[PDB]
Amino acid sequence: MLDESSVKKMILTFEKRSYKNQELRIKFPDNPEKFMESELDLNDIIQEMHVVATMPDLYHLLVELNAVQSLLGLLGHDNTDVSIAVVDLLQELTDIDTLHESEEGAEVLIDALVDGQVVALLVQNLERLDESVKEEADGVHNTLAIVENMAEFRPEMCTEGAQQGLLQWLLKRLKAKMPFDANKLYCSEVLAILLQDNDENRELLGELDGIDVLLQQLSVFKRHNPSTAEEQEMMENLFDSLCSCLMLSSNRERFLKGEGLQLMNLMLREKKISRSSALKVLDHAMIGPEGTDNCHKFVDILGLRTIFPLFMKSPRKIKKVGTTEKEHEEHVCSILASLLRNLRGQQRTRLLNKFTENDSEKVDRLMELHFKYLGAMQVADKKIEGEKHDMVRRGEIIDNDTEEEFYLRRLDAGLFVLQHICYIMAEICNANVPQIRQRVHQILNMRGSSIKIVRHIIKEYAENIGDGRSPEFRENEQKRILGLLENF
């Protein structure tokens, strides 16, 4: 080990050499010979400095002695070897394992770096590196390691970082006509983090024509499978990114114009590995009111003929793919629920037609699913009553923390899909089609379930609905939904 004073010296040496080199570079610009040694030193000491990351306790030392500010000046150094060695150091310094060791050290340095506008300085650095040169491609990888490290410790900076030119770089890097590459995979991972719960970055993606990018890149896997598990993990990151963007009502319009629906559709038809995610996207593209135009387009392009088969039978591939029956059933019903919510006109009619062909077979299915999930809910709830009874025996007050455990168990049992199924039933029964009401009541009353149980599930659904959006919205939906009970 080394000591505070043995560290202060090492830094003061850096500053020494940093300064020296800057001067000689400015004073002897034509002649590598006069400054080169100065450089090799800066390089060596910059490297030696890595050891500082071992003791994150002494991080005020790097800010105090002005080491952090010059170190950024270095990212712009006219030779890549210095610039990349800086990045190396920034990666080691900023490694999350390290940043958790001492709060103070972490806290002070991040502030220095934000102050520095590091993300814009790293991006200027990226714009000059050439991935054809191996040591520079590793530089891209390492700068990307940093933003990840920094976002893991402090998410709020991602907004600033993205705007600071990063998002644009990523988009151009994913587009670029270059063979698939570990840096490409990493770009994909880093992009999706930038968007995680971040409307500001999701919109900025929109404005940059991000969606087109995601759709060309995703369209590589429409008919053919991806070669490798790395290249398959990228695809999945692209989808992740894509769904995240669709969380914002403004991107639904951009998706549509990008012929996004057609792609996800084509994916479903070709039944490749993309199919599970493509179904998820469709779901995100249609979910609430901001789904409306997309719903209508879905039908226009024949989405109905693609989705209902998947409503009737859940895919064989389930043991191999990773998406479970439950998940798959969750999305389809989600999608139908959005279709029933938002469709009007010809398209609505065509949808309702699917419930009448042939002897209302889809109604039977719907009700098959009703019982499946209802049943699971009843066990889940019974178990919960039991546990509450056992808490009282044992003297344990139930609290919100308990309630949250309980909620999660219901979520795992199929609460959401159950809610959707019942919404669908109710909407179906309010299309003034006697055939369809009959089948529901027929089916419902003879067996062990009842209108009463369904009505109840709807109310709960209404009550907790629109958790997402605005106080006036939550009022309006709740109203509309509860209106479906009048003729049911």
Author numbering: 76 to 563
Manuscript excerpt for this entry:
CTNNBL1 is a widely expressed, highly conserved 62 kDa nuclear protein that associates with components of the RNA splicing machinery. CTNNBL1 comprises a HEAT-like domain (including a nuclear export signal), a central armadillo domain, and a coiled-coil C-terminal domain. Our results identify CTNNBL1 as a unique selective NLS-binding protein with striking differences from karyopherin-αs.
We crystallized full-length human 6xHis-CTNNBL1 and N-terminally truncated 6xHis-CTNNBL1Δ76 (to generate a fragment that is necessary and sufficient for NLS-peptide binding). We were unable to solve the structure using molecular replacement and therefore crystallized selenomethionine-substituted protein for experimental phase determination, solving the structures of CTNNBL1Δ76 and that of full-length CTNNBL1 from crystals with the symmetry of different spacegroups. Residues along the central spine of the solenoid and the CTD have low temperature factors, consistent with their role in stabilizing the core of the molecule, whilst N and C-terminal regions beyond the CTD display higher B-factors for solvent-exposed residues, implying greater flexibility. Preceding the ARM domain is a region (PRE-ARM domain) comprising 6 α-helices and connecting loops, which do not form the ordered triple helical arrays that constitute armadillo repeats. As in HEAT repeats, the CTNNBL1Δ76 PRE-ARM helices also contain conserved hydrophobic residues in the buried interaction surface of the helices where they mediate intra- and inter-repeat packing. In order to probe the NLS binding mode of CTNNBL1, we generated multiple mutants of CTNNBL1Δ76 based on the crystal structure. Strikingly, all mutants retained the ability to interact with the CDC5L NLS3 as judged by a pulldown assay. Thus, CTNNBL1 likely recognizes NLS ligands in a manner very different from karyopherin-α.
